[PDB]
Amino acid sequence: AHCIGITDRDFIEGVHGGTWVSATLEQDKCVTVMAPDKPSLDISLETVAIDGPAEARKVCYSAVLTNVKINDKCPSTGEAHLEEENEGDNACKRTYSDRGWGNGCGLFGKGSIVACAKFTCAKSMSLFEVDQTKIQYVIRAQLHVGAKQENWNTDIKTLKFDALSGSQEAEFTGYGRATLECQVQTAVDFSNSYIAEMEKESWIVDKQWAQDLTLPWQSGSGGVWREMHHLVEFEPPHAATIKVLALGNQEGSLKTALTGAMRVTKDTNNSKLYKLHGGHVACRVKLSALTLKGTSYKMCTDKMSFVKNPTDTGHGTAVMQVKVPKGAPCRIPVMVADDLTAAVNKGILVTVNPIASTNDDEVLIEVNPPFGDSYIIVGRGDSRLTYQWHK
Amino acid sequence: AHCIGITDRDFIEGVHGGTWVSATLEQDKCVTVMAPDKPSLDISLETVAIDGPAEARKVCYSAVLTNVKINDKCPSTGEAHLEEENEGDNACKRTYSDRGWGNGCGLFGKGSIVACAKFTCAKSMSLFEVDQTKIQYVIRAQLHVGAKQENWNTDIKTLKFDALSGSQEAEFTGYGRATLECQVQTAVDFSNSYIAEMEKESWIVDKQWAQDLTLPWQSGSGGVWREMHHLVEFEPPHAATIKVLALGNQEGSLKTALTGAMRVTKDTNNSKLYKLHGGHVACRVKLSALTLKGTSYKMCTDKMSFVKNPTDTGHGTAVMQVKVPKGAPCRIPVMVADDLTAAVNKGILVTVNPIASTNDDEVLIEVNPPFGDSYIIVGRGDSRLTYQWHK
Amino acid sequence: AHCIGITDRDFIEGVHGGTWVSATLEQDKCVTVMAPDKPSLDISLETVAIDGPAEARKVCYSAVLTNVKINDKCPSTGEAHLEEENEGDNACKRTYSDRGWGNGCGLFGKGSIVACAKFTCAKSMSLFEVDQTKIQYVIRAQLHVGAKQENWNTDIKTLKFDALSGSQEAEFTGYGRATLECQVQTAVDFSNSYIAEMEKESWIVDKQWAQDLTLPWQSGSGGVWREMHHLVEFEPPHAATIKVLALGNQEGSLKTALTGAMRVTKDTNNSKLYKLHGGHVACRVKLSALTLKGTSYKMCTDKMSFVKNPTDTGHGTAVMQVKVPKGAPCRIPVMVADDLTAAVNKGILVTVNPIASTNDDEVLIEVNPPFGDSYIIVGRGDSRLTYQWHK
């Protein structure tokens, strides 16, 4: 019952017959869906992911200007030039200096200076495109067979999806089968956004934001960086010198903007998987094909005992564990009542027909008792167990 | 006259006699000072040097965070512990986590969790206290003797104003002496500030700002880093685990905050001299002890020549060089006239009395011609040089 | 019949259908359960306990500051540090002192000073976290066999329970057996608390209160104390000196807060056991398997005598002890009548069928006389003991 452990649990109540029940899931939340006689079904998300998204940009946030040269010409001697100015790895600026006799010229007009510097990205973001059609989904499903928690880790059923895959069927030994539609494409519309990756961290952010970044960037595998001035200061030109300086590591400013984004976690082993949080889904549940097991076994009579008392899940339910020490595969009766007379059950039972699978067996039960005080009763008979519960 | 070569130049005229004159000097700029019968003096502020600061703080802008450890305890089994928390260099944080029957406990309350990791400073900024007793103001002074531009740097006098040398005497060969008072005590407000130094760039910064930085720091002599929570962030705990992530390198953000501070350049030679950019100082000039070297001389009447023609420095003054190949102890007649008949002189000479003193002497002359059309006339008789001018 | 010894006694009565009777047992009170046709039961809550709580915090109420070191620096020579400041068992404070030539400092102004002292707890309050699942309790049961007060502790049955021993059976020789089924406690009053222990005094305290105490604390594994500044007082600096003094022993203030808490007591022999006062336990009693020992026996006729004359219990009942010196394997006829025509036993007998069993047996009888005047009567004609009793 994986749904016991997730704080955001929702309960959905259904109807009999050949019918579907609607549900919606979020990556941190779980639904228990219940229906008049079907064993109740737990459903949660497990991942939303893209596999091998395609490179779309690199954006540079630290650069080294490895060498620099200047050319300068007197005010009447025309425009200055440097052969580096036409070579793609060099950031170059043209501007006019204050020439004169003090600086080695015959005339006092404005002179011409060019400054060029060899660029090199030290560290850069990789921006990856997400094809909204290629996203992958995984759903967890369970029925309350009444298994102990030491068993959940194997009983849990994993339903894998992609945005193109159809409704899928789950098989539970004995209880039969279910089918879920999950129309994921109506939930997530992450087109017009893309994955921004940085060393050991990643985000998803809007493309129009990223294109508008005032940082130098590269259009693909190799080739020149395209807006180099966004990382290079050229000082106001002196007589024949322009000090050029790199603007320093912009990792911290870039992270500051990303703080609002939905996070992305790179898979530790299937290296090219990128798990994408926040994305929800809508699903509809074919409850009709489930069945209870063992409806026709005998009801218990043995002197049962608690393995753990009822405890408040915070979902409003009480979860409890019981054992039949020396019985056949008997049905374990349970009810909630206003008084020891117990003339009727007055509560809702999540586990619908708990059965001892073996002669020594231990079983889990969960109940949703009404408001106020009520007596939880298990083992209707002379040798009743009870716990005086309160909301 | 080095101020022919500085693009921001002001003119000041003393009432009479060189009695007492005032100026404000700013690092980019120069003042030319005139008086009715005394040689003109060029004054400018060369540098404002601060000598031998002492360290106050280092502020770390990029921490590498290592050897993370976590400990967590079941939701009603007391509170967490790590030995690493005894050590001042681990940035440990303590909180609570959702727990439940599927996550290692009998209860559904909140389990205490604590996580520690070692904060190592990869790069840090040095803040220095500035000794306001050790500020040196350097003024350059030279006369308009008529020296050619190759010689200006050997004619210039350099005067240094520490807090004690409040009045200084400029001496010139033959032209007498001039006294400068520079009011260092009212020039800057250093006491409430620190030198901030990053690698090969430095700033002078307000002390309140430097201390109110939300960024982790260490005492000048070393020891412990005091405010590590400003760079170490802890993501909200999953059931059994908490991930700690270092915030990025803040260099670009720190420089962005510094976009308003006055830059300071460290000396290549004296490893503890710091030269402030953009300072100013109020100064006063006593001209009364200057003399004009050659008022006793004869007039020229020989075949003079232009080594450099009058050229238009943007100050609106015409600068020329005349060579006097014959009569040596002689004065050059210069006038600017509205017509070649030379009926009146319409230009102030800045070189107040251009004397030759060898049979080959080359004398720079600067004239302030009137608005409209005029003739710069140098010489007498038939050997005159006459040059047309226009504002 | 130990209900006699407990002042806060309630009577509860059965109905001839033999239904379970439910009763509320509270730590100072006692209950006599009377059946219509079967012997009456003393039932009373003896203890409620936790066996070995979980150690959660020690909080310090008396402290000593065993070693003190101070460091001071001049106003323009940086900021002071100490090796102790890196070392976790030192409490530390940083501030500034007014320096000047009067204390060896060359510049007048505020100078940084820092002081550190070794914290050491002399007495700490232990706080143990209570866990409802570990609560234990004990009920005492005793039928009104008629035994001497001197024989009660030999004859009472002590019934132990825990959260999982669902029901217990009490066996009374000859009279048969009864079974109790119980809530481990109804006492939700203990929720969200700690057991607080000082030397030989203990209390139950709200978790919020205990954690918000302005006193330094540590986790039970032996950490280092987390808020030492609550007990170190730092004198304002004077030259190079700070005096640090320990704020005094807080035992009385902490006790003054604790006066409202429910008391907790520690066992003398099994020191992990804390007896938690003030609880409510609810139980059901199965009366059906009780029986009356001697209903077939002869009815007394030899002269009885009073060992203790009838006396007022304060519960409205009267108690006597009677001696049967001959013929003793025989029923003692006791009745309360309106007058010596002895028409009917207008009273209710709590000792439902007093039998003597040995040739000099002495038997206690408890009667509930009617309102108004009455005669207590025991025996048969010409041999009746009688005693006037008025409400």
Author numbering:
A (entry chain A), B (entry chain B), C (entry chain C): 1 to 391
Task: Quote the study on this structure.
Yellow fever virus (YFV) is a re-emerging flavivirus that causes severe hepatic disease and mortality in humans. Crystallographic studies have resolved the structure of the YFV E protein and shown that its domain architecture is similar to related flaviviruses, with three N-terminal ectodomains, known as domains I (DI), II (DII) and III (DIII) and a stem anchor region known as the transmembrane domain (TM). Here we use a chimeric virus platform to resolve the first high resolution cryo-EM structures of YFV. Stark differences in particle morphology and homogeneity are observed between vaccine and virulent strains of YFV, and these are found to have significant implications on antibody recognition and neutralisation.
Introduction of R380 into bYFVES504 also resulted in more homogenous virions, allowing for its ASU to be resolved to a high resolution. The symmetry expanded local reconstruction method was used to resolve the ASU of bYFVES504 T380R to an initial resolution of 3.2 Å. To help elucidate all particle stabilising interactions that might be mediated by T380R, the symmetry expanded map was further refined after a focussed 3D classification around the previously ill-defined icosahedral three-fold axis. This resulted in two final maps with the three-fold axis E protein in two discrete states, which we designated up and down. While the global resolution of these maps are similar to the previous, the three-fold axis E protein is well resolved in the down map, allowing accurate modelling of the E protein in all three positions. Residue R380, which is located on a non-surface exposed loop of E-DIII, makes contacts with neighbouring E proteins at three unique inter-raft interfaces. The five-fold axis E protein R380 residue makes two intermolecular bonds with the backbone carbonyl groups of D382 and R384 and the two-fold axis E protein R380 residue forms a salt bridge with E87. In the down conformation, the three-fold axis E protein R380 residue makes a bond with the side chain hydroxyl of T133, while this contact is not observed in the up position. The atomic model of the bYFVES504 T380R ASU was then compared with the atomic model of the bYFVES504/DIII17D ASU and was found to be highly similar (rigid body whole ASU Cα RMSD: 0.82 Å).
